[PDB]
């Protein structure tokens, strides 16, 4: 038969499935999904690097007038400073002063670092999902990837499953990304062309390799000295020399979640959150008919020791009486208790036990083995320790669940006073029952 | 403090710490010494601790229909000799005795 | 795991205290206890011959 599973988005815990196909046995399948990540989508916007101050030589203007020709250049900057008096070995090395002038001109560029060590402003939106999911089926300890969208068919061992869609369109990118080489983060960057001077988001390329950038330096150039031969100019602080330390943290350790992000490409595994429904698919190569699967009768079970852990804190013990040799699949069938075992293998009259786990105090419960019910109950108990590192099972509950003696106390204290308020209504009509005649 | 949740922990360049929380200290079980409510301090601690007060409301709002069922019985047992004439109902205070059944 | 209790002070008495964790099953200890020795703390404060 088809049949169609629900998952929550957790990692870690072997949830379990019954396919029901009437006149067959009943199949206990596992799954486990091992990985689980979110693929945005990739629009690189902008590059953008450390960049460098390109300073020709100054143009020492011996008592003419000098001027500069306005070139195209990304911060092209200019004076002609007057009365200036340079020195060297022999003093000055020219002669007049009065109209002595000099040209002084910069730009800024890119550099090295821009080949190899930058920043990406990056665009991504709406992401696609994929993952990598095991199966204990039938002593098989199978495993498949699919990218998990509801649209992906794939068959393998007589089994033909869709995994997806996801419930939940949480995503955790924004508009904007940024990448470093190793890490990720969720800013909202100046737009290419806007670069605000001084802060991240100045100096910018589309490619990593283009001739031409756009920059804002606010260059100024100042006055030089009495013989100081040099360029004097305002120092152009850029967002990079300085962006080690105002990072606050990588998304790794923002996340909502619990999601690890790695780059290149920038994947978010294990992203937990939600519930996946998938759709498995198997004729009848590996059902089992009703008649020929071992049918069992003196369903005896009990529980010596149950202890309301996050480990296998109940071993149930139950002594049977079958029909014949052969596995035989054993499930639960309330959502207050989970089982470690798929199928056990049964001869006759013999006697099993299970590795099971619950949350609350006391509960009875009604085992299926092999569309047989066998109802056994338990007390149990808290583990001592506080803390463990690893996700329950059973924990999943609700609030009105059944205990020990609690629902006994509840039934005790409710006693009741309305058969004596009735026995109030009884004196009220025996006293009206003189003239209550009418209406 | 973990959450209900769980705590993720990094420490310096190694890989990261993973806890979550479990059972109480759990001073608790379940007798004629109750130790119940240490149970609820698990399930909740204070979230459905209005649960047991408004369980407590809703006896005492139970009792306070026990006293007006009083109330009006003791009124509506007046009513049958709210001032009779007669002097003398044995037939209905002896039979009835509500207050003061000297008054024949 | 963890227990504490009370045992009367007494020499050349045995001794069983049951030791119960949950799960598991239960133990009894045997103990027995052969001194009580009393150490004073001392200070001379002269001698006489
Ligand atoms: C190393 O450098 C090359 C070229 O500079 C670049 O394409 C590549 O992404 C870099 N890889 C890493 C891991 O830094
Ligand atoms: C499948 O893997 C789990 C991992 O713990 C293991 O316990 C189980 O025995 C394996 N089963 C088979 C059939 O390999």
Redesign the pocket.
Same mark, same amino acid.
């Given at each position: 038969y088809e049949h169609v599973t629900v998952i929550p988005n957790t990692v870690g815990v072997p949830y379990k499935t019954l396919v029901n196909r009437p006149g067959y046995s009943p199949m206990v399948l596992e799954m486990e999904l091992q990985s689980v990540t979110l693929e945005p989508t990739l629009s690189l916007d902008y590059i953008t690097c450390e960049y460098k101050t390109v300073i020709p030589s100054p143009y020492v203007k011996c008592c003419g007038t000098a001027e500069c020709k306005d070139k195209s250049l990304p911060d092209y900057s200019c004076k002609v400073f007057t009365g200036v008096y340079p020195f060297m070995w022999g003093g000055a090395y020219c002669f007049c002063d009065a109209e002595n002038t000099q040209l002084s001109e910069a730009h800024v560029e890119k550099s090295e670092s821009c /080949?190899?060590?930058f920043a990406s402003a990056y665009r991504a939106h709406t992401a696609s999902a994929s993952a990598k999911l095991r199966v204990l089926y039938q002593g098989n300890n199978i495993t498949v990837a699919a990218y998990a969208n509801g649209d992906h068919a794939v068959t393998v061992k007589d089994a033909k499953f869709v995994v997806g869609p996801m419930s939940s369109a949480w995503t955790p990118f924004d508009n904007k990304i940024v990448v470093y /080489?190793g890490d990720v983060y969720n800013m909202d960057y100046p737009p290419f062309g806007a670069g605000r001077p001084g802060q991240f988001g100045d100096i910018q390329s589309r490619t990593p390799e283009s001739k031409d950038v756009y920059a804002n330096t606010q260059l100024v150039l100042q006055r030089p000295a009495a013989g100081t031969v040099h360029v004097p100019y305002s120092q152009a602080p850029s967002g990079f020399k300085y962006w080690l330390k105002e990072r606050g943290a990588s998304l790794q350790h923002t996340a909502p979640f619990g999601c690890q992000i790695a780059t290149?490409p920038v994947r978010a595994v294990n992203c937990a959150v939600g519930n996946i429904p998938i759709s498995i698919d198997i004729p009848d190569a590996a059902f089992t008919r009703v008649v020929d699967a071992p049918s069992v009768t003196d369903m005896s079970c009990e529980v010596p020791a149950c202890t309301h852990s996050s480990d296998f804190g109940g071993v149930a013990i139950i002594k049977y009486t079958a029909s014949k040799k052969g596995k035989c699949a054993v499930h639960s069938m309330t959502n207050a208790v989970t089982i470690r075992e798929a199928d056990v293998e049964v001869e006759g009259n013999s006697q099993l036990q299970i590795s099971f786990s619950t949350a609350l105090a006391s509960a009875e419960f009604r085992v299926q083995v092999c569309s047989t019910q066998v109802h056994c109950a338990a007390a149990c108990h808290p583990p001592k320790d506080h803390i463990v590192n690893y996700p329950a099972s059973h924990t999943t509950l609700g609030v009105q669940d059944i205990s020990t003696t609690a629902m006994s106390w509840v039934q005790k204290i409710t006693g009741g006073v309305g058969l004596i308020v009735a026995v109030a209504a009884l004196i009220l009509i025996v006293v009206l029952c003189v003239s209550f005649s009418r209406h | 403090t973990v959450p209900t949740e769980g705590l993720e922990v990094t420490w310096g360049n190694n890989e990261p710490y993973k806890y979550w929380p479990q059972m109480s200290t759990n001073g608790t079980a379940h007798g004629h010494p109750h130790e119940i409510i240490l149970y609820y301090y698990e399930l909740y601690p204070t979230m459905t601790v209005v649960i047991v007060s408004v369980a407590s409301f809703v006896l005492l709002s139970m009792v306070g229909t026990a006293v007006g069922m009083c109330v009006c019985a003791r009124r509506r047992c007046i009513t049958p000799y709210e001032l009779t004439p007669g002097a003398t109902v044995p037939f209905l205070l002896s039979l009835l005795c509500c207050v003061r059944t000297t008054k024949a």
């Amino acid at each position: 038969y088809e049949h169609v599973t629900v998952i929550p988005n957790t990692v870690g815990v072997p949830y379990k499935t019954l396919v029901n196909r009437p006149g067959y046995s009943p199949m206990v399948l596992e799954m486990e999904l091992q990985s689980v990540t979110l693929e945005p989508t990739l629009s690189l916007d902008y590059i953008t690097c450390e960049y460098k101050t390109v300073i020709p030589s100054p143009y020492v203007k011996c008592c003419g007038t000098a001027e500069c020709k306005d070139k195209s250049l990304p911060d092209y900057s200019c004076k002609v400073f007057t009365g200036v008096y340079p020195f060297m070995w022999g003093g000055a090395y020219c002669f007049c002063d009065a109209e002595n002038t000099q040209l002084s001109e910069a730009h800024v560029e890119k550099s090295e670092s821009c /080949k190899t060590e930058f920043a990406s402003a990056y665009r991504a939106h709406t992401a696609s999902a994929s993952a990598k999911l095991r199966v204990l089926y039938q002593g098989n300890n199978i495993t498949v990837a699919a990218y998990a969208n509801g649209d992906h068919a794939v068959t393998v061992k007589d089994a033909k499953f869709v995994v997806g869609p996801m419930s939940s369109a949480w995503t955790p990118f924004d508009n904007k990304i940024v990448v470093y /080489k190793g890490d990720v983060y969720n800013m909202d960057y100046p737009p290419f062309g806007a670069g605000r001077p001084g802060q991240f988001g100045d100096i910018q390329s589309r490619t990593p390799e283009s001739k031409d950038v756009y920059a804002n330096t606010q260059l100024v150039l100042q006055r030089p000295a009495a013989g100081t031969v040099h360029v004097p100019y305002s120092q152009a602080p850029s967002g990079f020399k300085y962006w080690l330390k105002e990072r606050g943290a990588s998304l790794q350790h923002t996340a909502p979640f619990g999601c690890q992000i790695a780059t290149n490409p920038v994947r978010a595994v294990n992203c937990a959150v939600g519930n996946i429904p998938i759709s498995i698919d198997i004729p009848d190569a590996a059902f089992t008919r009703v008649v020929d699967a071992p049918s069992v009768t003196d369903m005896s079970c009990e529980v010596p020791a149950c202890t309301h852990s996050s480990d296998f804190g109940g071993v149930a013990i139950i002594k049977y009486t079958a029909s014949k040799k052969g596995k035989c699949a054993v499930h639960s069938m309330t959502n207050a208790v989970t089982i470690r075992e798929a199928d056990v293998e049964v001869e006759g009259n013999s006697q099993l036990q299970i590795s099971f786990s619950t949350a609350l105090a006391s509960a009875e419960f009604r085992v299926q083995v092999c569309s047989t019910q066998v109802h056994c109950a338990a007390a149990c108990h808290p583990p001592k320790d506080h803390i463990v590192n690893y996700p329950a099972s059973h924990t999943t509950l609700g609030v009105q669940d059944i205990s020990t003696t609690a629902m006994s106390w509840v039934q005790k204290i409710t006693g009741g006073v309305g058969l004596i308020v009735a026995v109030a209504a009884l004196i009220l009509i025996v006293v009206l029952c003189v003239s209550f005649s009418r209406h | 403090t973990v959450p209900t949740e769980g705590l993720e922990v990094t420490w310096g360049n190694n890989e990261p710490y993973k806890y979550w929380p479990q059972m109480s200290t759990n001073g608790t079980a379940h007798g004629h010494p109750h130790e119940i409510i240490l149970y609820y301090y698990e399930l909740y601690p204070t979230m459905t601790v209005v649960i047991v007060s408004v369980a407590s409301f809703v006896l005492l709002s139970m009792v306070g229909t026990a006293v007006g069922m009083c109330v009006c019985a003791r009124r509506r047992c007046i009513t049958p000799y709210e001032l009779t004439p007669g002097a003398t109902v044995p037939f209905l205070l002896s039979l009835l005795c509500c207050v003061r059944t000297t008054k024949a």
